[PDB]
């Protein structure tokens, strides 16, 4: 039903046949491919105005000279990848094909990278690519064995975090199907901050370090709140060398009525599965902008498991520590 | 005051040759050329409320917005221009409302709000489901009044947004009127905050009853809430009239424990939702020593830690009563 | 009503600030963002002046208190702002102000340069502010054109009941560091009218005078 | 400091009401009432400023403007509380008498402002003027008062006047003002703009170096002037009338 220029086509084909030595078929195929590409670009333009991917999720650039479309998605993604799609004429079949240019998709098995029938189900193809990329990232995370597998939901990752000393509970992290930023179900301000930190993270080692620090400072915050709800911590003291007892964190607490320069020192040792606390008494001074460990006691190191610490133990320690 | 740039709200007047009447043709809808324009373009906004059953994960339709129709007199409507004008105003207002709802809820994914399609949005609550849909025309339940009320307050909030925009525009010329999604657009935030605040209030009531009322008899609980030119003053008055709805919900609960030896500790717990979704519980426990010597004053964002500290406080009070 | 005091040490050493920072480290609760301050003196260039009319005008610029300038002359104070967010809305609305003002120092040193001329300039940058129990202490090194000048200490508290005890404690703390020549001041410009920043500027002027 | 680009005009009060309606037809905004009080101060002649570099003319003495807003409770007499506070009250402000007299203004004693003569040359289509501005927030001391402050700087009072009118805010930061001016002395109050309203349309530019913005501002002002053709004639005032230096005395009113 397209308004074809019938007479101009007549003269053009007659001239081609007169100058022909084949060429008409090649020109017709090229024009058909160009028209299909142009209408695909027009569909992209129509969808982008009101589509789910309008807010910087998808960007498409079309070149008529090379007759190819480059699509970039997930601009705010630095997980050692950049979401790129190329739509162009296949040399072997002389047909327009869509290729998801990704090495992760390249070595992925039982997963097609090239798709046809773009006009009919471009949205379905985009959704399939989105889900496949999310599944590949999730499978990499599971292979690193940082997040346990959720049986109920295949798109939800479980992260094990101790809410209290004895509690050991999972938190559900989910992947946005549009832009691809990890998010929590009911994030706390610290949880939201570290989710944002995860979002712009770049390396798998960086992600693992981020999660390790998340567990560590979550425990630190829990115990610091426990102390403050009953204790004056110090957020100013930085020692050049960590105290000899796997992540070690030193916390220096005291009370206003204590003797000067005498601090209760807690060395928190966090492992992949277990955490312990070394409670000692030390003397530290500040001289010319430096923190000097004047004295440390090792014969009376209290090595205590994380779970056993409770409020009553805290107050009994407060009474005995003087 | 509307910032909706998609449509200009311009209608051409056409004298109908056949019926000798007057009709209005909008600028945008230039594709439908026929006498079925009225039904083809008649869109509406529907609110559906589903109640989650405690025995199954499925949701049952418990309420729906009542579609009261003023178009029953079709012959009168097709010849009265004023009715067409009112219908077009309603249509454009609903379109703007739906667009604003989309742009507002696009940022509430982290709290259990999702968008199904270009015309549907879904809000989930531990016991309820809300669906807002834009649908074309082509037994009284319990929650039908609820959905009608929801629609009414959504329209009211959109009107308040328009009034705020106009007041800001009149106040100063230099200020570029570019609405901020984080600040200006406040439509689903107040309703969602009220509902979730009620849910958290019920949960904390249950927790306090289980851990204090059931353990320590005689506790007394009190519930409290803590708050030139004619045109500018008129707008200020009209906007201030909606403070009780737009303002952040708050609650305070004072618990007085009956103790002897003229030593009566107080437990004041104030619950707030600073960002309209998160629950913040501030606890002030004053031991029976002095009127200003607050024994403890803490804040909590996790209900589990709230319960743990409540249990610790109960144990400490029991020990004090035992000494 | 908050109270404030200013102590200036003239014979200080470059490392005296660190010495006082460490000597108070036991009671230090927290640390906040750095601050800066400017101190200009303008002179009268007209010779047909009466005997009782002063010749100087001291301009003190506070950077942390929202970019505000204070002009002092003969126990008379004047407070000017230069930020667009400090403008009372009435002046913006009626047309009395174009909305983007300039600092008064530009006015003195550009348009009125035939009446007032600059004579000195004393600056302080990258000071440190420490929160102690019910107290805030700010320290900074003063640099003139030639070089290092001395040490400046400013103390601010909200409760005025025990201000004198805190001043005496800080004086003793300086005493153990053997800084024996220090000039302190906590005076008030007006006994009946109390403006915080004007009184602070007056105390700065009384401390920094030679 | 701003570059203010301005156009001026005047109208007779007879068309006043009509004019107002037309403005609302264009801008889409209603007028807003306002008032102000300006005091002009000049360098003290008792002090000999030999520092004026006579051989080089580095600078010339100038006049300082101090402005303040005054509540309408001082401008409304006992006959006028019944009417609401809107623009129509200006229709009753045709007499040379006014409730605010000399004694009240003397009892009052802000925004400090200095300006220069507009730019020279005959290839300028709008009045371009340079303004340096600052704000006085408060004060203290044994003689905290505007008069004492300006005498401390070296300035003395010269005269004062009161402006009452309406404001229209249009797009692109364009401000249109309709004013009535009352000069005030101990001898009495005299309305200089007798039987008419002074019209002034202006825009402000924050940085004088930006020239694309200045061209846009001039385009907007000339488009506004070409819109009002046939009703009111907006014109560039005389460059020698907007000169406020002490050596030569005249005052555009």
CA C26/CA D146 separation, integer angstroms: 49
Residue B172 touches partner C, C-beta closer than 8 Å? yes
Question: What is the separation of C-alpha B256 from the centre of its chain, rounded to a whole number of angstroms?
Answer: 34
Closest CA to B204 of B303, B299, B287, B123: B303
According to DSSP, the β-strands at A68-73 and A148-149 are unpaired
CA B135/CA B117 separation, integer angstroms: 12
End-to-end Cα, chain B, rounded Å: 68
Taken as a whole, chain C contains a residue count of 210
CA B218/CA B212 separation, integer angstroms: 10
Q: What are the distances in angstroms from CA A9 to CA A6, A32, C197, D123?
A: 5, 14, 86, 59
| Degrees to nearest 5, angle at CA D137 with D134 and D139 | 120
Tokens describing residue C160: 């005025």
Contact A246, A271 (CB under 8 A): yes
- Pick among C77, C86, C94 to test the D interface (most D CBs inside 10 A): C94
Shortest Cα distance, chain C CAs vs residue D21, angstroms = 21
Taken as a whole, chain B contains a residue count of 323
DSSP letter for A2, please. -
Chains C and A touch (3+ CB pairs under 8 A): yes
Residues of A in contact with C28 (CB under 8 A): 236
Q: What is the resolution of this structure in A?
A: 4.3
- Pick among B168, B172, B231, B236 to test the C interface (most C CBs inside 10 A): B172
C107 and D149 within 8 Å at the Cβ level: the answer is no
* Secondary structure of residue D87 in the 3-state scheme: helix
D33 and B228 within 8 Å at the Cβ level: the answer is yes
Closest CA to D113 of D66, D43, D147, D153: D66
Residues of D in contact with C82 (CB under 8 A): 134-135
Q: Which chains touch D (3+ CB pairs under 8 A)? A: B, C
H or E element in which residue A263 lies: strand A262-270
Q: How many CB atoms lie within 10 A of CB C93?
A: 18
CA quadruple B152, B154, B158, B163: dihedral sign: positive
Sheet holding A83-89, edge to edge: A58-63, A68-73, A83-89, A96-101, A114-115
CA A138/CA C158 separation, integer angstroms: 55
CA D179/CA C98 separation, integer angstroms: 17
C100 and D206 within 8 Å at the Cβ level: the answer is yes
CA B244/CA B227 separation, integer angstroms: 9
* Secondary structure of residue A116 in the 3-state scheme: coil
Residue C110 touches partner A, C-beta closer than 8 Å? no
Q: What are the distances in angstroms from CA B110 to CA A193, A195, B124?
A: 13, 11, 12
Tokens describing residue A232: 């004056």
Contact B252, B270 (CB under 8 A): yes
CA B65/CA B154 separation, integer angstroms: 13
CA A233/CA D146 separation, integer angstroms: 52
A288 and C18 within 8 Å at the Cβ level: the answer is yes
DSSP letter for D242, please. S
CA D3/CA D204 separation, integer angstroms: 6
Contact C70, C62 (CB under 8 A): yes
Contact C32, C207 (CB under 8 A): no
Contact C170, C7 (CB under 8 A): yes
CA B253/CA B208 separation, integer angstroms: 10
- What are the backbone dihedrals phi and psi of residue A283, each rounded to the nearest 5 degrees, phi first? -130, 120
End-to-end Cα, chain D, rounded Å: 23
Residues of B in contact with D32 (CB under 8 A): 170, 228-229, 231-232
**Which candidate from C15, C25, C31 shows the least CB-CB separation from A286?**
C25
Q: What are the distances in angstroms from CA B195 to CA B128, B156, B205?
A: 10, 18, 15
Shortest Cα distance, chain D CAs vs residue B228, angstroms = 6
Contact B231, D30 (CB under 8 A): yes
Tokens describing residue A71: 């699509």
Question: Hunting for tokens 């385009």 — which residue is that?
Answer: D219
Residue D2 touches partner C, C-beta closer than 8 Å? yes
C22 and A287 within 8 Å at the Cβ level: the answer is yes
H or E element in which residue D191 lies: strand D188-191
Q: What are the distances in angstroms from CA D215 to CA C154, C196, D210, D222, D229?
A: 50, 46, 9, 11, 21
User: With 0-12 CB in 10 A as exposed, 13-18 as middle and 19+ as buried, what is A189?
Assistant: exposed
Residues of C in contact with D142 (CB under 8 A): 75-76, 190
Contact D137, C80 (CB under 8 A): yes
Residues of B in contact with A228 (CB under 8 A): 298
Contact A113, A48 (CB under 8 A): no
User: With 0-12 CB in 10 A as exposed, 13-18 as middle and 19+ as buried, what is D123?
Assistant: exposed
By C-alpha distance, the chain C residue nearest D33 is: C94
Residue B312 touches partner A, C-beta closer than 8 Å? yes
CA D247/CA D230 separation, integer angstroms: 39
Beta strands in D88-215 (DSSP E): 111-115, 127-141, 155-169, 175-185, 188-191, 196-205
H or E element in which residue B267 lies: strand B266-272
Q: What are the distances in angstroms from CA B250 to CA A192, B197, B240, C104?
A: 23, 8, 18, 45
Discontinuities in chain A with C to N beyond 2.5 Å fall right after 21, 230, 245
**Which candidate from B170, B174, B228 shows the least CB-CB separation from D29?**
B170
- What are the backbone dihedrals phi and psi of residue B223, each rounded to the nearest 5 degrees, phi first? -105, 135
According to DSSP, the β-strands at A262-270 and A290-296 are unpaired
CA A204/CA A146 separation, integer angstroms: 11
CA A130/CA A114 separation, integer angstroms: 14
DSSP letter for B88, please. H
C99 and D204 within 8 Å at the Cβ level: the answer is yes
According to DSSP, the β-strands at C68-73 and C182-185 are unpaired
- Within 8 A by CB and 6+ apart from B255, the residues are B208, B212, B219, B220, B221, B222, B266, B267, B268, B269
DSSP letter for B225, please. -
Contact A157, A138 (CB under 8 A): yes
Tokens describing residue B295: 């024994």
**Which candidate from B118, B302, B305 shows the least CB-CB separation from A50?**
B118
Tokens describing residue A279: 């409670």
Q: How many CB atoms lie within 10 A of CB A242?
A: 11
CA C104/CA C110 separation, integer angstroms: 10
Method used to solve the structure: cryo-EM
| Degrees to nearest 5, angle at CA D84 with D103 and D97 | 30
Count CA within 13 A, CB hemisphere, residue A116.
6
Tokens describing residue C186: 């906590």
Q: What are the distances in angstroms from CA A65 to CA A68, A90, A112, D30, D185?
A: 8, 16, 28, 56, 81
Residues β-bridged to residue D159:
D40
Question: Hunting for tokens 């009268």 — which residue is that?
Answer: C44
Residue A2 touches partner C, C-beta closer than 8 Å? no
Residues of B in contact with A184 (CB under 8 A): 110
- What are the backbone dihedrals phi and psi of residue D226, each rounded to the nearest 5 degrees, phi first? -70, -15
CA C9/CA B316 separation, integer angstroms: 52
Closest CA to C98 of D130, D213, D223, D167: D130
Contact C209, C85 (CB under 8 A): no
B304 and A188 within 8 Å at the Cβ level: the answer is no
* Secondary structure of residue C70 in the 3-state scheme: strand
CA B125/CA B195 separation, integer angstroms: 9
Taken as a whole, chain D contains a residue count of 253
Residue D30 touches partner B, C-beta closer than 8 Å? yes
- Within 8 A by CB and 6+ apart from A225, the residues are B298, B305
Residue A291 touches partner B, C-beta closer than 8 Å? no
Tokens describing residue A167: 């509690």
| Degrees to nearest 5, angle at CA B134 with B130 and B139 | 60
**Which candidate from C15, C18, C28 shows the least CB-CB separation from A236?**
C28
Residues β-bridged to residue C145:
none
* Secondary structure of residue B154 in the 3-state scheme: helix
Closest CA to D144 of D132, D133, D134, D136: D136
Residues of A in contact with C30 (CB under 8 A): 235-236
Contact B216, B317 (CB under 8 A): yes
| Degrees to nearest 5, angle at CA A67 with A64 and A71 | 100
Residue A259 touches partner C, C-beta closer than 8 Å? no
**Please, what's the b/e burial string for C19-56 (b: 16 or more CB within 10 A of its CB; e: otherwise)?**
bbbbebbeebeeeeeebebbbbbbebbbeeeeeeeeee
Contact C59, C104 (CB under 8 A): yes
């Amino acid at each position: 039903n397209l308004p074809l220029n019938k007479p101009r086509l007549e003269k053009l084909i007659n001239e081609i046949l007169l100058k022909s030595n084949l060429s008409l078929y090649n020109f017709l195929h090229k024009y058909v491919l160009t028209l299909q590409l142009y209408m695909v670009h027009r569909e992209f333009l129509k969808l982008a105005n009101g589509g789910k991917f309008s807010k910087s999720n998808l960007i498409h650039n079309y070149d008529s000279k090379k007759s190819t479309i480059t699509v970039r998605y997930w601009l705010n993604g630095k997980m050692d990848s950049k979401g790129k799609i190329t739509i162009g004429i296949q040399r072997t079949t002389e047909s327009l094909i869509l290729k998801w240019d990704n090495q992760s998709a390249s070595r992925a098995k039982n997963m097609p990278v090239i798709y046809n029938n773009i006009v009919s189900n471009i949205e379905g193809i985009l959704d399939e690519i989105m889900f496949n990329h999310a599944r590949i990232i999730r499978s990499e995370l599971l292979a690193r064995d940082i997040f346990q597998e959720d049986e109920e939901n295949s798109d939800v990752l479980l992260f094990q975090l101790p809410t209290t000393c004895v509690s050991m509970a999972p938190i559900q992290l989910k992947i946005d199907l549009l832009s691809g930023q990890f998010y929590f179900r009911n994030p706390t301000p610290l949880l939201s901050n570290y989710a944002s930190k995860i979002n712009r993270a770049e390396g798998p080692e960086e992600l693992a370090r981020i999660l390790q620090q998340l567990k560590l400072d979550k425990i630190i915050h829990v115990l610091t709140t426990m102390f403050e709800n009953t204790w004056s911590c110090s957020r100013i003291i930085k020692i050049d060398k960590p105290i000899r007892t796997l992540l070690q964190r030193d916390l220096f607490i005291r009370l206003p009525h204590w003797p000067l320069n005498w601090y209760l020192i807690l060395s928190i040792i966090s492992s992949k599965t277990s955490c312990v606390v070394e409670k000692r008494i030390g003397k530290i001074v500040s001289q010319r902008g430096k923190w000097n460990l004047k004295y440390l006691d090792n014969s009376n190191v209290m090595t205590v498991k994380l779970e056993s610490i409770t409020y009553q133990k805290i107050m009994i320690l407060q009474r005995t520590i003087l | 005051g509307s910032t909706y740039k998609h449509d200009r709200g311009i209608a051409n007047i056409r004298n109908n040759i056949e019926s000798q009447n007057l009709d209005l043709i909008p600028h945008s809808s230039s594709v439908f050329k026929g006498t079925d324009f009225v039904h083809s373009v008649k869109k509406f906004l529907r609110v559906r409320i589903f109640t989650k059953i405690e025995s199954e994960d499925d949701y049952i339709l418990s309420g729906e917005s009542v579609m009261d129709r003023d178009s029953e007199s079709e012959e009168a409507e097709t010849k009265d221009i004023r009715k067409q004008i009112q219908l077009l105003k309603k249509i454009i207002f609903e379109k703007e409302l739906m667009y604003q709802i989309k742009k507002e809820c696009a940022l509430l994914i982290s709290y259990g709000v999702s968008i199904e399609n270009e015309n549907k949005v879904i809000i989930e609550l531990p016991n309820e489901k809300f669906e807002i849909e834009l649908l074309s025309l082509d037994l009284p339940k319990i929650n039908d009044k609820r959905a009608n009320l929801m629609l009414v307050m959504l329209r009211l909030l959109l009107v308040v947004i328009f009034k705020k925009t106009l007041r800001s525009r009149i106040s100063s010329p230099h200020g570029l009127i570019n609405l901020n999604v984080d600040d200006d657009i406040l439509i689903i935030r107040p309703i969602l905050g009220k509902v979730r605040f009620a849910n958290y209030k019920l949960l904390l009531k249950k927790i306090i009853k289980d851990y204090v009322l059931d353990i320590v008899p005689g506790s007394s609980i009190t519930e409290t809430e803590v708050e030139d030119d004619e045109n500018i003053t008129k707008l200020n008055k009209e906007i201030r009239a909606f403070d009780k709805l737009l303002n952040i919900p708050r609650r305070e609960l004072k618990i007085n424990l009956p103790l002897t030896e003229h030593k009566s500790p107080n437990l004041s717990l104030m619950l707030e939702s600073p960002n309209y979704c998160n629950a913040l519980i501030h606890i002030k426990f004053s031991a029976g020593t002095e009127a200003n010597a607050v024994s403890f004053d803490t804040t909590f964002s996790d209900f589990k830690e709230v319960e743990d500290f409540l249990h610790f406080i109960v144990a400490e009070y029991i020990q004090q009563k035992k000494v | 009503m908050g109270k404030s005091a200013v102590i200036f040490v003239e014979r200080a050493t470059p490392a005296t600030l660190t010495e006082l920072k460490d000597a108070l480290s036991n009671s230090i609760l927290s640390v906040r963002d750095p601050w800066s301050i400017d101190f200009r003196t303008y002179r009268c260039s007209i010779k047909n002046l009466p005997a009782d009319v002063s010749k100087l005008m001291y301009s003190i610029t506070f950077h942390h208190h929202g970019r505000q300038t204070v002009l002092i002359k003969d126990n008379s104070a004047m407070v000017t702002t230069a930020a667009a967010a400090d403008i009372p809305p009435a002046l913006v609305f009626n047309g009395s102000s174009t909305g983007v003002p300039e600092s008064i120092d530009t006015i003195l040193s550009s348009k009125l340069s035939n009446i007032w001329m600059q004579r000195q300039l004393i600056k302080g940058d990258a000071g440190e502010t420490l929160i102690l129990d019910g107290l805030t202490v700010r320290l900074v090194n003063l640099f003139s054109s030639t070089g290092f000048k001395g040490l400046l200490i400013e103390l601010q508290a909200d409760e005025a009941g025990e201000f004198e005890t805190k001043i005496a404690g800080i004086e003793g703390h300086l005493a153990e560091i053997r800084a024996k020549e220090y000039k302190t001041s906590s005076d008030s410009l007006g006994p009946d009218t109390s403006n915080e920043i004007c009184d602070l500027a007056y105390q700065y002027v009384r401390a920094l005078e030679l | 400091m701003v570059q203010q680009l301005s156009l001026f005009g005047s109208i007779g009060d007879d068309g006043y009401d009509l004019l107002i309606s037309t403005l609302t037809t264009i801008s889409g905004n209603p007028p807003l009432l306002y008032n102000s009080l300006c005091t002009v101060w000049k360098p003290n002649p008792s002090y000999d400023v030999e520092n004026v570099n006579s051989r080089n003319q580095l600078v010339e003495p100038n006049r300082i403007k101090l402005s303040k807003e005054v509540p309408f409770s001082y401008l409304i007499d006992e006959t006028m509380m019944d009417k609401p506070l809107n623009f129509r009250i200006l229709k009753s402000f045709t007499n040379d008498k006014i409730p605010l007299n000399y004694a009240m203004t003397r009892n009052i004693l802000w925004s400090l402002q200095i300006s220069d003569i507009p730019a020279a040359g005959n290839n300028r289509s709008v009045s371009m003027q340079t303004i340096a501005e600052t704000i006085i927030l408060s004060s203290a001391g044994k003689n905290s008062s505007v008069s004492s402050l300006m005498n401390g700087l070296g300035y003395v009072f010269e005269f004062q006047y009161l402006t009452i009118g309406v404001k229209f805010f249009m797009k692109h930061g364009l401000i249109l003002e309709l004013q009535k001016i009352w000069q005030i002395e101990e001898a009495g109050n005299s309305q200089i703009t007798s039987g008419g309203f002074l019209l002034k349309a202006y825009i402000n530019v924050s940085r004088g170096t930006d020239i694309d913005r200045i061209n846009y501002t001039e385009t907007a002002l000339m488009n506004l002037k070409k819109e009002l053709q046939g009703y009111i004639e907006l014109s560039v005032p005389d460059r020698q009338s907007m000169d406020s230096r002490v050596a030569h005395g005249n005052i555009l009113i």
